[PDB]
Amino acid sequence: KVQTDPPSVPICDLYPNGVFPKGQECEYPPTQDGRTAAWRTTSEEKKALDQASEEIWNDFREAAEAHRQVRKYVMSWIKPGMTMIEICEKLEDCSRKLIKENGLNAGLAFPTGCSLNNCAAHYTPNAGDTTVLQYDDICKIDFGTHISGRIIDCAFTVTFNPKYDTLLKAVKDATNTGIKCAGIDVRLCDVGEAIQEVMESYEVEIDGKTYQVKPIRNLNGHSIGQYRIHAGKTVPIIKGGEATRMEEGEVYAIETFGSTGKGVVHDDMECSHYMKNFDVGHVPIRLPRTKHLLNVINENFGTLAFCRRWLDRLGESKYLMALKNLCDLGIVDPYPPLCDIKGSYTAQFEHTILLRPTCKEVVSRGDDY
Numbered sequence: 344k345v346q347t348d349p350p351s352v353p354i355c356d357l358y359p360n361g362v363f364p365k366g367q368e369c370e371y372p373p374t375q376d377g378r379t380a381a382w383r384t385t386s387e388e389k390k391a392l393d394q395a396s397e398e399i400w401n402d403f404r405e406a407a408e409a410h411r412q413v414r415k416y417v418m419s420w421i422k423p424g425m426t427m428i429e430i431c432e433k434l435e436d437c438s439r440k441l442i443k444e445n446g447l448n449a450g451l452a453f454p455t456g457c458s459l460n461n462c463a464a465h466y467t468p469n470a471g472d473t474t475v476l477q478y479d480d481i482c483k484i485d486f487g488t489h490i491s492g493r494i495i496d497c498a499f500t501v502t503f504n505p506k507y508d509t510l511l512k513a514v515k516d517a518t519n520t521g522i523k524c525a526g527i528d529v530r531l532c533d534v535g536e537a538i539q540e541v542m543e544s545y546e547v548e549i550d551g552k553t554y555q556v557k558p559i560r561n562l563n564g565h566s567i568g569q570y571r572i573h574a575g576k577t578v579p580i581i582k583g584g585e586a587t588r589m590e591e592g593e594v595y596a597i598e599t600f601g602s603t604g605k606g607v608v609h610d611d612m613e614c615s616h617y618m619k620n621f622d623v624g625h626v627p628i629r630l631p632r633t634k635h636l637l638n639v640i641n642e643n644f645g646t647l648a649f650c651r652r653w654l655d656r657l658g659e660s661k662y663l664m665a666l667k668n669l670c671d672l673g674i675v676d677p678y679p680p681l682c683d684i685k686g687s688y689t690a691q692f693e694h695t696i697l698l699r700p701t702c703k704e705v706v707s708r709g710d711d712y
């Protein structure tokens with residue numbers, strides 16, 4: 344079918360067949376020896392294997408298409424003057440429609456991160472936040488969608504002042520380098536090393552000061568699992584990491600962060616992000632308020648991340664203490680904003696890739712980034 348200017352037509356209605364557009368497909372990187380992998384996108388044994396998980400790939404694609412159309416729409420109206428809340432509500436309303444939100448079967452994978460300046464991630468406004476987007480602000484729009492738990496974790500950076508251009512370019516190039524180096528049997532530490540090489544190859548000048556872009560060392564990429572945004576493996580963006588290898592059938596979020604500060608982040612500001620620990624099982628709770636809140640989370644989010652605004656919209660009131668109890672019990676983990684030093688600028692770019700038996704698919708790739 345056809346999408347209305349302001350996106351409103353759910354993605355599955357634009358593809359009645361049930362088959363969604365594939366992302367960018369690439370040949371796996373050749374081995375150190377010089378061994379090519381073009382045989383994978385050919386081997387009958389791999390082909391059947393890949394086709395066997397087609398429904399899965401397809402679900403990732405449905406979510407990726409939603410992500411592509413939502414972000415394009417956002418890039419058309421995001422502007423200084425708007426509050427962070429106005430920005431997140433407008434984005435999420437469109438996302439809910441295009442993904443055709445349906446309980447845990449289809450919806451938003453996590454809250455809309457819109458971290459500003461020295462803060463690189465995990466910031467989304469809570470109720471009452473009067474923060475307004477400024478002309479010189481560098482905002483990281485990081486939002487996700489999912490179908491049946493197949494998560495699309497994709498992100499980009501927003502600026503209005505050209506002075507940040509090379510900084511954005513550096514991080515974008517670094518993220519793309521990480522995407523190219525990634526592959527079946529590729530060592531994670533090699534990906535991180537390669538990413539840092541590109542990142543540090545860039546130098547920038549902002550308001551009279553020059554800087555060699557630094558990747559944020561304590562931030563990183565990660566493997567993705569069903570309903571588990573952080574499956575267990577990590578993709579470093581600096582050298583010195585694990586020699587652990589990426590494997591066939593795995594899904595990864597290739598994300599990098601560049602900064603003009605220390606290249607290190609720390610918790611800062613009021614927490615807005617929360618997510619149930621995946622490994623913790625059922626826990627009996629008598630405390631009335633804490634019990635109800637946990638039930639609401641299990642029903643509406645499962646192991647998917649959420650924020651306070653999402654609790655508010657569900658009619659929940661005065662739940663902070665109950666939420667703190669859940670955190671203290673280790674049932675829910677808080678994810679406060681991660682920021683570099685005051686006055687520093689940070690940028691981010693992220694894509695979700697599928698390590699298919701036949702090829703490497705950058706499922707969330709768009710004509711934008």
Ligand SMILES: Cc1ccc(NNC(=O)[C@@H](O)[C@H](N)CC2CCCCC2)cc1
Binds near residue numbers: 485562616
């Ligand atoms: C240190 C470290 C840094 C980043 C990551 N992964 N990625 C992220 O957190 C972002 O790209 C996610 N979209 C945001 C989300 C991830 C789960 C917890 C709530 C916030 C994992 C570890």
Ligand SMILES: [Mn+2]
Binds near residue numbers: 485486
């Ligand atoms: Mn993300």
Ligand SMILES: [Mn+2]
Binds near residue numbers: 496565693
């Ligand atoms: Mn991520």
